Amino acid sequence: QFDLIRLNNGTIELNGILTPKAEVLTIEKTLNIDELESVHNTFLTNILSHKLFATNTSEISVGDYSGQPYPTSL
Amino acid sequence: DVPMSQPLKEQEVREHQMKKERFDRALESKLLG
Amino acid sequence: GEIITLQAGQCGNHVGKFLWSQLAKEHAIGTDGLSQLPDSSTERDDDTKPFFRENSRNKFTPRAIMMDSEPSVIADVENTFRGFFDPRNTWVASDGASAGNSWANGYDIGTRNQDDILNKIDKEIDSTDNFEGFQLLHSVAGGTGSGLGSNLLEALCDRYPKKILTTYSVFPARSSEVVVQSYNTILALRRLIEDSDATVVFDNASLLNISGKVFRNPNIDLQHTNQLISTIISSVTNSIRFPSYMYSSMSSIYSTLIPSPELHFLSPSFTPFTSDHKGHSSYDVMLDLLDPSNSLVSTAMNNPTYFNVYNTIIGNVEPRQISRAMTKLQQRIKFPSWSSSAMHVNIGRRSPYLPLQPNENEVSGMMLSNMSTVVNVFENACNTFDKVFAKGAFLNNYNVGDLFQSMQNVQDEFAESREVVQSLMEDYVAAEQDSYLDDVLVDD
Amino acid sequence: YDLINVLKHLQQIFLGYQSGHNVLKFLTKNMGELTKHYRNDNNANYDKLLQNFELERQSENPNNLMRQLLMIQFDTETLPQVLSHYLQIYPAIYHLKFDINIPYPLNIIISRTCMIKYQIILRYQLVLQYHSRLLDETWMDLNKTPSWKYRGYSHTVKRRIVRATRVLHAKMNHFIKTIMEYFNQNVIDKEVYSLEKCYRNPTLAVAIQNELEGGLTNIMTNRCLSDLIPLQLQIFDIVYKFCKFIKSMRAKLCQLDPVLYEGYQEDAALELIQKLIEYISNASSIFRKCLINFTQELSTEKFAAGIERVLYSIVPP
Ligand SMILES: Nc1nc2c(ncn2[C@@H]2O[C@H](COP(=O)(O)OP(=O)(O)O)[C@@H](O)[C@H]2O)c(=O)[nH]1
């Protein structure tokens, strides 16, 4: 039941306020349309966020000794 | 009429409590207050 | 650390019946192997796993191998524990009854069945991931009992060289049967001295000295007093079953109990208790425990040397009481000049399901110690042995299997077994002397 | 929120209250994994232990949020460096620590102050458990591996090396556990009862917050964290060293005794005996110096039940 966010620093964050139990003093985590699209975009982005595919940016380390983006060599 | 000292337990308690306080104050500072 | 109980001979199986009964009470599990608890509360605040193969089902299977030559003792237990025990872990020496009360007979049947016995042991080890060890329940002078224990021990000490196999040795009061029973004791004891892990001594004489006061007399019977044996066993594992945060392992337990590679036979004591417990203070329980009147071994010494003293108090213990008791105990224990006296005191827990728990504002507990006089439990057997197996019928006509390949393997096995026992006694005595380490630690 | 359940979970995690069971299973699995990062190692490859942790965490009942949120992280200062700073202890092993992202609203009571104190307590206890566990393994080797079987080395080895090793070891086992029993019984358990009895049927949120931090401070202020750490550290170095000496040197000694070595007939084994004797004599001396210094420090509090029990286990007959 716990909605937990894993962070890269090891933190597991509860996603929001911890709610009380059903016993109180006095539902489903479904996705909406944008959320579904977002998940999909996130996914494709993640594939292409892998370092080896970053051929459109100066941020890709261009190999090391070859001096080229990994896909050039591949 | 005489140069009498303060209470012994009270001083012991204060030494204990002051130690506790110094420590907690140091921790509060690291947490930036 | 998973533990497998080995129930050998009728004594071992009768003792197990009491042990498992107490465990079923401690962990509210029925005789059918089911939790007695509602499942409305899924957290039990205990761990039955080391003793039971809790199933995916509401089933707790005792981690035990039931072994005998006489299937009726096992059946008496299985027929009580109607679903609790797994019958596939039951072995009976069906290929001939033991030829009388000789460890050799028990040994010979175990030897022939050694592979089958081990297969059952491994079927249960296969149900344990973190297997740590075994608990062997047996009489010391029974044919099937000590013989099976001798076979089990030889098979297991080599097959599982890194696992812990402890022994729960039940000693008959010495009587005329000793002309056979002392060699069963002595030769099976040789095997224990050489191969067994820490062993605890239960002297039937003391079970009776005590049961004559605490059991419903006339039934103060040794198979009835298995509750006293069970009380000690369950007390020892209480730190495992309802673990606290200090001692959670057998290896941790023995780290302060075993001073050398020598097998030590330890002497338990216990007071007060409830079974089918209102002590006043832990102060008093600890002090009361350092008294032979609460002992299950009739060492009867006024000034024995103690080594490795440990006790566990379970209940609402006040640390001030504990400290005061240690203060005085520290001043009145005999121990060698070469070792500071360190008493180890552990605090345990009452089962959350113990029916007594809601009204327990009282404490009780157990003491275990390494006594230079623990060996007194073997004295009458030894003196008998020296006079009887030097040359009597008792030496050769009770031997079967390898023990009687020739008389030579009798004459020397018996003499050597006596010597192994003599050495055990000599070392308990050597440890009483300052010279034990004065000829060690300043030898440079 | 069942705050009490949350709290027992927290206690089980950082005090290890009633959880020696879980301390041991994790500690044992990773016992040898606590040997390298502090030896000046810029260890960025302990991900395997991190993963072992996560895998173990995954086995826990999901209802226990406090376990579900637990994380392993590393520091730059080891426990005694941290303590010397905070307790103004007249001034190097283990950078590991755990935390929990305590969610709102419960984090209003379980403050960061509480959590940092919890890390300190836990690290302290884990260190003691580490050394205890090393000693537990050590007697298992000494009294089980057939080095105990050596005879063919004479009494000139049996006494001054074998009995000497085993007794020094036992003294150490008794010392470490005595201290641990003290800490857990005279420090941790009483604070836990305080928390439960201060609770019972509480009237003030503040009182709860107060006792929680209060007890944790009382622990932080324990003489064992304040005054005695420098010697505990000497003992810890001693335990580690003797435990690593054992098994390795145990095996080496087999070359002298034909019961295992049988080939051998070398002065090298005789050199081994002399090395073992000198090592052991020094081993005894440094252990005793620590015990002496320890005893002496305890004796100067200018006056203790939890101290007297410790001294009892130390002071020679
Ligand atoms: N305390 C105790 N003693 C027992 C029990 N059962 C039998 N004895 C003792 O066991 C000794 C011999 O071993 P036993 O297992 O009974 O016989 P075996 O099956 O033929 O080996 C006898 O001297 C009895 O006094 C028991 O359950 N508890």
Author numbering:
A (entry chain D): 678 to 703, 715 to 762
B (entry chain U): 112 to 144
C (entry chain A): 3 to 278, 286 to 453
D (entry chain C): 413 to 503, 556 to 726, 751 to 791, 801 to 814
Can you provide the manuscript's text about this entry?
Microtubule (MT) nucleation is regulated by the γ-tubulin ring complex (γTuRC), conserved from yeast to humans. In budding yeast, homologues of the grip-containing proteins (GCPs) GCP2 and GCP3 (Spc97p and Spc98p) and two copies of γ–tubulin (Tub4p) form a 300 kDa complex (γTuSC). Spc110p, a distant pericentrin homologue, recruits this complex to the nuclear face of the spindle pole body (SPB), while Spc72p recruits it to the cytoplasmic face. In yeast, the CM1 motif is required for seven identical γTuSCs to helically assemble into a γTuRC at the SPB.
Previous moderate-resolution cryo-EM structural studies (8 Å) had shown that wild-type (WT) yeast γTuSCs complexed with the N-terminal domain of Spc110p self-assemble into helical filaments (hereafter γTuRC) having 6.5 γTuSCs/turn, thereby presenting 13 γ-tubulins to template 13-protofilament MTs. Although close to MT symmetry, the γ-tubulins within each γTuSC were too far apart to correctly match the MT lattice, adopting an open conformation. Realizing that this would require much higher resolution of Spc110p-γTuSC interactions, we focused on obtaining higher resolution structures of the ‘open’ (γTuRCWT) and disulfide trapped ‘closed’ (γTuRCSS) filaments containing Spc110p by collecting new datasets on a direct electron detector and incorporating symmetry expansion and 3D classification into the data processing pipeline. To improve the resolution, we performed symmetry expansion followed by focused classification of segments containing three adjacent γTuSCs. The resulting reconstructions were at a resolution of 3.6 Å and 3.0 Å for the γTuRCWT and γTuRCSS filaments, respectively. During the transition from monomer to assembled open state (as seen in γTuRCWT), the γ-tubulins move in the same overall direction, approximately orthogonal to the plane of the Spc97p/Spc98p contact interface. The center of mass of the γ-tubulins shifts ~13.8 Å and ~15.6 Å when bound to Spc97p and Spc98p, respectively, as a result of twisting the helical bundles in Spc97p and Spc98p. Notably, much of the bottom three helical bundles show only minor changes when assembling to the open state. The dominant changes occur on loop Spc98pH10-S1 in the middle contact, which moves ~4.1 Å, and at the N-terminus of helix Spc98pH11, involved in the top contact, which moves ~6.6 Å. During the transition from the assembled open γTuRCWT to the engineered γTuRCSS closed conformation, the γ-tubulins on Spc97p and Spc98p slide past each other in roughly opposite directions, undergoing translations of ~6.9 Å and ~7.7 Å, respectively. Overall, these conformational changes alter the pitch and twist of the γTuRC assemblies from ~140 Å/turn and 54.5o in the open state to ~132 Å/turn and 55.1o in the closed state.
